[PDB]
Amino acid sequence: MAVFGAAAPYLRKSEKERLEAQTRPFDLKKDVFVPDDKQEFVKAKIVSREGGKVTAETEYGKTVTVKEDQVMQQNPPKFDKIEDMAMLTFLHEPAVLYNLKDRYGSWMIYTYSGLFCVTVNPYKWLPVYTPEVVAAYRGKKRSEAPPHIFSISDNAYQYMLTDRENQSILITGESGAGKTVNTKRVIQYFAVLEDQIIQANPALEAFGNAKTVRNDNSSRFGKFIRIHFGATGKLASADIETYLLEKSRVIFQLKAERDYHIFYQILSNKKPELLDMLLITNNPYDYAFISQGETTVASIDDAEELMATDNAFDVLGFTSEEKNSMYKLTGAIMHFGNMKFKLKQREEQAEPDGTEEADKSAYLMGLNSADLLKGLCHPRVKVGNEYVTKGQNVQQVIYATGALAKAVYERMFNWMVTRINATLETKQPRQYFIGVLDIAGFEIFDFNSFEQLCINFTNEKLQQFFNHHMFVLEQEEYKKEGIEWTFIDFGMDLQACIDLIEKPMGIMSILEEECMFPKATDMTFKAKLFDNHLGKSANFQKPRNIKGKPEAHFSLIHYAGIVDYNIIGWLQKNKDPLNETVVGLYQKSSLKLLSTLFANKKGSSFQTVSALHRENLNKLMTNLRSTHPHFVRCIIPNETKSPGVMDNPLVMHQLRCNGVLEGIRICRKGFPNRILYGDFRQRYRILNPASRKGAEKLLSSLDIDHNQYKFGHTKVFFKAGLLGLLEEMRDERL
Numbered sequence: 001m002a003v004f005g006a007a008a009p010y011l012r013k014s015e016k017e018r019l020e021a022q023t024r025p026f027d028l029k030k031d032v033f034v035p036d037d038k039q040e041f042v043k044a045k046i047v048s049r050e051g052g053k054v055t056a057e058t059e060y061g062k063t064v065t066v067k068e069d070q071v072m073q074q075n076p077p078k079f080d081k082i083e084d085m086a087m088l089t090f091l092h093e094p095a096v097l098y099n100l101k102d103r104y105g106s107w108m109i110y111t112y113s114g115l116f117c118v119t120v121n122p123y124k125w126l127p128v129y130t131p132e133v134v135a136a137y138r139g140k141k142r143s144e145a146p147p148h149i150f151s152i153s154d155n156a157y158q159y160m161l162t163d164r165e166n167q168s169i170l171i172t173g174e175s176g177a178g179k180t181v182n183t184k185r186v187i188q189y190f191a192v193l194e195d196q197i198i199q200a201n202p203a204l205e206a207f208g209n210a211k212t213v214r215n216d217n218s219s220r221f222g223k224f225i226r227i228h229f230g231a232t233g234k235l236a237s238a239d240i241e242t243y244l245l246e247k248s249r250v251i252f253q254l255k256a257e258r259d260y261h262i263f264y265q266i267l268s269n270k271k272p273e274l275l276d277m278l279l280i281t282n283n284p285y286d287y288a289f290i291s292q293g294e295t296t297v298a299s300i301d302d303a304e305e306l307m308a309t310d311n312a313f314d315v316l317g318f319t320s321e322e323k324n325s326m327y328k329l330t331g332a333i334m335h336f337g338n339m340k341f342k343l344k345q346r347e348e349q350a351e352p353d354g355t356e357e358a359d360k361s362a363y364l365m366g367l368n369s370a371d372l373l374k375g376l377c378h379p380r381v382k383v384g385n386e387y388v389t390k391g392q393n394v395q396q397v398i399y400a401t402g403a404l405a406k407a408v409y410e411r412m413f414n415w416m417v418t419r420i421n422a423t424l425e426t427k428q429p430r431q432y433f434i435g436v437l438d439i440a441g442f443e444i445f446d447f448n449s450f451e452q453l454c455i456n457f458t459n460e461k462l463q464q465f466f467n468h469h470m471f472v473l474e475q476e477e478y479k480k481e482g483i484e485w486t487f488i489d490f491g492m493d494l495q496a497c498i499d500l501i502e503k504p505m506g507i508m509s510i511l512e513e514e515c516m517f518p519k520a521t522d523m524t525f526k527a528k529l530f531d532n533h534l535g536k537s538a539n540f541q542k543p544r545n546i547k548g549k550p551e552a553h554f555s556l557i558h559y560a561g562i563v564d565y566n567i568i569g570w571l572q573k574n575k576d577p578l579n580e581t582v583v584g585l586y587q588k589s590s591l592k593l594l595s596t597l598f599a600n601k602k603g604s605s606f607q608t609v610s611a612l613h614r615e616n617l618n619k620l621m622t623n624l625r626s627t628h629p630h631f632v633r634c635i636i637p638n639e640t641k642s643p644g645v646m647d648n649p650l651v652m653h654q655l656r657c658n659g660v661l662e663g664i665r666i667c668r669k670g671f672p673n674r675i676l677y678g679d680f681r682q683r684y685r686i687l688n689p690a691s692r693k694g695a696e697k698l699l700s701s702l703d704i705d706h707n708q709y710k711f712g713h714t715k716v717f718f719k720a721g722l723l724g725l726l727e728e729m730r731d732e733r734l
């Protein structure tokens with residue numbers, strides 16, 4: 001609805017054309033959904049039923065014959081284009097896709113699907129962000145207000161006013177669906193400190209994004225923003241925190257992927273001062289840390305991004321000397337991919353050869369080149385009360401220097417985030433902040449690897465949290481009504497994958513113990529995985545060979561479906577041997593290295609990327625458990641920028657990954673249809689025209705089976721479909 005408040009003219013969709021559209025001829029007895037060959041979901045009409053095989057005619061026009069068993073029911077035209085699909089009485093997998101595509105063709109960006117708030121990505125200016133709409137949405141609840149994020153924000157505000165507890169808003173979806181723009185509009189709505197957030201956004205987007213296959217500006221890390229509020233419901237301050245940074249991107253790149261945008265921006269020649277002081281040859285192919293990926297791509301101009309980022313750095317809380325120091329640090333990180341470390345003759349010890357790039361790195365950090373080389377080649381460890389040296393060959397020192405590079409990059413990013421936060425806040429008292437989070441969803445490619453596995457595990461944990469919250473809400477409703485229906489927690493329905501991943505003897509534990517084995521390779525890792533899990537656990541299964549994929553080693557049945565991964569490269573990218581003497585050298589530099597490495601018990605060698613990822617995920621989960629969540633799902637309708645055409649398979653895959661259909665099925669598994677007794681008595685009596693006892697007599701006098709309904713005191717539990725049939729026959733009797 002859009003009347004009485006001057007909303008968007010197309011937002012109404014009521015009392016203007018719905019009356020003349022509900023009479024469209026759509027014979028449900030002959031209209032069904034047929035699986036296509038390209039879009040795999042296309043609507044079609046059946047001329048006649050010829051037994052098992054039925055001829056289907058589609059909108060595009062086809063005369064193929066299709067078996068009758070897989071073609072399934074089609075929604076009535078009268079209930080089509082409904083605002084909320086949560087109470088849809090004909091739940092179908094293509095029903096959601098068709099409703100979303102029709103609404104998007106009608107320019108319905110926001111659609112309610114229960115607790116979820118599906119928001120597609122258009123490419124145009126939307127007048128829905130008018131401050132008049134913001135003022136109108138104030139004081140409105142979920143039901144009365146039209147579908148928009150303002151309704152859920154007002155619900156969270158009311159929860160703060162009455163329940164007096166933390167509320168968190170969660171946004172997830174496929175990378176490139178508009179996470180940054182959506183969260184910018186969200187934080188702007190709570191703003192109406194916003195300018196500080198807008199100016200700080202490019203720095204984080206440049207230091208924590210990389211060009212993936214699907215998206216060129218995907219945010220690998222997770223961003224959490226807390227909006228501190230006062231006692232009287234007024235904005236106090238803001239602080240941000242980042243989680244789950246990917247050191248793998250810093251250390252390794254795929255054949256069709258790029259590193260973080262900072263290195264490529266620095267490689268631009270429009271800022272000769274940085275290149276001059278960093279001793280850079282301006283050729284990305286001269287550095288192994290960057291050249292192994294994609295050198296450069298089109299559809300981007302990193303010069304403008306560098307200008308935006310350094311302009312934000314200049315006019316901010318801090319000065320430019322530390323910006324120069326950060327540029328020096330990133331240049332040194334680029335420089336670490338050049339030493340040779342030739343093995344000594346007749347000995348397993350490793351000695352350096354190219355003592356030129358080492359000198360450059362030492363000058364950049366202010367360290368001693370000889371001391372740095374001695375520390376890298378001959379680390380020193382304290383045994384008992386004395387100190388001894390350790391021998392290290394070329395592979396060990398290579399792993400150590402890679403770990404040092406990724407660790408210093410992560411610490412520099414964390415220090416920058418902390419500095420921006422310390423600039424951001426203001427000294428007003430803070431009470432019961434509001435959290436905003438955005439993390440990429442169930443990303444699935446044809447070459448799934450360790451990073452994809454970590455992202456899938458994080459999203460798996462998030463889905464587990466969402467299911468647990470939904471079960472808690474359902475049980476709270478059951479206790480309110482005093483009757484429990486299917487009181488089985490949904491956490492165990494999903495804990496199988498988490499146990500396969502996180503629990504001991506799982507994939508992560510096996511990889512961690514294989515990293516420390518004397519002579520361990522990837523084939524041995526796969527062999528141990530098969531010996532430990534093939535047949536023991538239902539989730540683990542053999543890989544599949546479909547559509548001519550390159551290669552797969554093992555497959556898991558995730559929450560979104562079957563995913564096949566790849567093994568090669570996991571061992572190299574999981575080892576994180578952090579040298580300690582080099583850290584001690586870092587603590588004595590004449591630079592920001594003291595601030596970055598201020599604090600530095602498991603052993604240094606027994607450190608893995610998986611362990612740090614798991615502990616960070618646990619910290620994020622234990623932080624999020626204390627706040628009441630609010631789930632927002634964002635999807636991209638079209639792979640290109642044209643809103644006119646939207647690909648059906650892509651939307652189907654994204655909907656399956658996001659679990660909106662799964663969520664609505666979980667909601668409808670119980671008794672979601674609840675209505676008030678008096679309203680039922682005074683409205684639905686027209687079903688067969690001629691307080692608790694009167695309502696019971698009325699419902700029992702309408703030829704209704706007693707097993708389908710459940711009587712209560714305030715809210716009556718009704719099975720899905722009963723209310724729809726009751727109301728559709730009531731209209732006929734009018």
Ligand SMILES: Nc1ncnc2c1ncn2[C@@H]1O[C@H](COP(=O)(O)OP(=O)(O)O)[C@@H](O)[C@H]1O
Pocket residue numbers: 121122123124125126175176177178179180181182215217218219
């Ligand atoms: N509500 C919106 N209206 C118009 N354009 C949008 C909207 N949301 C996202 N976009 C488009 O998305 C693009 C960037 O998406 P972004 O949020 O950077 O993706 P990612 O989350 O992968 O970084 C922008 O060019 C912008 O035009």
Ligand SMILES: [Mg+2]
Pocket residue numbers: 178179180217218219
């Ligand atoms: Mg983003």
